[PDB]
Every structure is written in C-alpha cells, then in structure tokens.
Amino acid sequence: TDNTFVSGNCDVVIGIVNNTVYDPLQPELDS
Amino acid sequence: TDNTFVSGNCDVVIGIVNNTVYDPLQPELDSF
C-alpha cells in the first residue's frame, strides 16, 4: 500500500492483473 | 494525513481555514 495508490476500479484499466497487495498495517494490528 | 503534512501552526498562516483532517488509521484502530 505504501508503493501504490488506490485509483478508480478494476473495470477501467485495460489489461489489469490480479495480485495480492501487502498491507503492513494488517499484521502489526493482528500481532 | 497522507495527502498533507504538518508545517507550522494555525495562527501563523494568513487566510488559513479550519476543517477535520481524516486519519485512515482511526477505523483500523477501531477494530484493534
């Protein structure tokens, strides 16, 4: 999430691919 | 907080306005 920014939706970009975006805040709050 | 940064104080800026800056960490801490 720190190397990318959220813009629009996935139905806009032509050729978008699916991958897991790692959020460093999730494991810090879970631990 | 990610779209802006903290510089100076509210009193030293001319024509400055008041608002509520949204902190994305707040809703994440609500579940925590």
Curated annotation (Swiss-Prot), chain B:
Q: Which domain of life is it from?
A: Viruses
Residues the record marks as carrying a glycan: N18
What this protein is reported to do is described as: Subunit of the fusion protein that is processed upon entry into the host cell. Mediates fusion of the virion and cellular membranes by functioning as a class I viral fusion protein. Contains a viral fusion peptide that is unmasked after S2 cleavage. This cleavage can occur at the cell membrane by host TMPRSS2 or during endocytosis by host CSTL. In either case, this triggers an extensive and irreversible conformational change that leads to fusion of the viral envelope with the cellular cytoplasmic membrane, releasing viral genomic RNA into the host cell cytoplasm.
Q: What is this protein called?
A: Spike protein S2'
UniProt gene name: S
Entire protein: shown range: 1117 to 1148 of 1273
